[PDB]
Amino acid sequence: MLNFKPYRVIMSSLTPVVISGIAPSLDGILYEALSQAIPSNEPGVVLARLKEILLFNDELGVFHASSLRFGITPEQGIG
RNA sequence: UUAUCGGCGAGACCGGGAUGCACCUCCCGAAGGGUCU
């Protein structure tokens, strides 16, 4: 329970991204990050802590975390 | 993060030759002097 505001996160890719069929969801990245932060791999507690930093759609059952989208500049494109 | 895992690596001389030198005066003028046992 914390005031959540829509934010866009953009990062500089340093190495190739390997997509496992489904585009990587930022909710998964944050789940792994919390699993590192909270020394526990139990999905329940990591999810409960993830809901505290991410807005969760109860009616839809997902986190408000868009999938990966490649930011391409006029210099470098998707390769 | 659609799973679980994986050093890319090992060997090599790049070196062998050459004068950069050949010609020029920098000189032309002046009083530093005068005051005190």
Side-chain angles (χ1 to χ4, degrees), chain A residues 20 29:
Chain A
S20 302
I29 279 69

mmCIF file of all heavy atoms in Angstrom, chain A residues 20 29, chain B residues 1-2:
data_model
loop_
_atom_site.group_PDB
_atom_site.id
_atom_site.type_symbol
_atom_site.label_atom_id
_atom_site.label_comp_id
_atom_site.label_asym_id
_atom_site.label_seq_id
_atom_site.Cartn_x
_atom_site.Cartn_y
_atom_site.Cartn_z
ATOM 1 N N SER A 20 12.467 -15.006 -24.327
ATOM 2 C CA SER A 20 11.985 -16.382 -24.221
ATOM 3 C C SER A 20 10.562 -16.491 -24.771
ATOM 4 O O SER A 20 9.612 -16.848 -24.078
ATOM 5 C CB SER A 20 12.058 -16.850 -22.774
ATOM 6 O OG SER A 20 13.379 -16.764 -22.276
ATOM 7 N N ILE A 29 11.283 -8.822 -13.973
ATOM 8 C CA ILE A 29 12.557 -8.231 -13.577
ATOM 9 C C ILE A 29 12.493 -7.803 -12.119
ATOM 10 O O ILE A 29 13.402 -8.079 -11.327
ATOM 11 C CB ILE A 29 12.919 -7.055 -14.503
ATOM 12 C CG1 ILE A 29 13.542 -7.564 -15.806
ATOM 13 C CG2 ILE A 29 13.888 -6.084 -13.821
ATOM 14 C CD1 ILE A 29 12.578 -8.294 -16.707
ATOM 15 O "O5'" U B 1 10.029 -14.314 -13.859
ATOM 16 C "C5'" U B 1 10.931 -14.885 -14.795
ATOM 17 C "C4'" U B 1 11.039 -14.045 -16.040
ATOM 18 O "O4'" U B 1 11.421 -12.690 -15.686
ATOM 19 C "C3'" U B 1 12.099 -14.478 -17.041
ATOM 20 O "O3'" U B 1 11.667 -15.532 -17.881
ATOM 21 C "C2'" U B 1 12.395 -13.189 -17.787
ATOM 22 O "O2'" U B 1 11.392 -12.914 -18.753
ATOM 23 C "C1'" U B 1 12.292 -12.163 -16.663
ATOM 24 N N1 U B 1 13.603 -11.911 -16.027
ATOM 25 C C2 U B 1 14.497 -11.098 -16.687
ATOM 26 O O2 U B 1 14.253 -10.580 -17.760
ATOM 27 N N3 U B 1 15.690 -10.913 -16.041
ATOM 28 C C4 U B 1 16.071 -11.450 -14.832
ATOM 29 O O4 U B 1 17.185 -11.188 -14.381
ATOM 30 C C5 U B 1 15.091 -12.283 -14.211
ATOM 31 C C6 U B 1 13.920 -12.479 -14.818
ATOM 32 P P U B 2 12.657 -16.123 -18.997
ATOM 33 O OP1 U B 2 13.884 -16.598 -18.311
ATOM 34 O OP2 U B 2 12.765 -15.130 -20.093
ATOM 35 O "O5'" U B 2 11.884 -17.398 -19.555
ATOM 36 C "C5'" U B 2 11.709 -18.554 -18.745
ATOM 37 C "C4'" U B 2 10.440 -19.289 -19.092
ATOM 38 O "O4'" U B 2 9.304 -18.450 -18.756
ATOM 39 C "C3'" U B 2 10.284 -19.647 -20.567
ATOM 40 O "O3'" U B 2 9.605 -20.893 -20.700
ATOM 41 C "C2'" U B 2 9.409 -18.519 -21.099
ATOM 42 O "O2'" U B 2 8.665 -18.845 -22.253
ATOM 43 C "C1'" U B 2 8.508 -18.235 -19.905
ATOM 44 N N1 U B 2 8.009 -16.856 -19.861
ATOM 45 C C2 U B 2 6.705 -16.607 -20.234
ATOM 46 O O2 U B 2 5.937 -17.477 -20.600
ATOM 47 N N3 U B 2 6.327 -15.292 -20.162
ATOM 48 C C4 U B 2 7.103 -14.225 -19.768
ATOM 49 O O4 U B 2 6.613 -13.096 -19.758
ATOM 50 C C5 U B 2 8.442 -14.562 -19.397
ATOM 51 C C6 U B 2 8.836 -15.836 -19.459
#
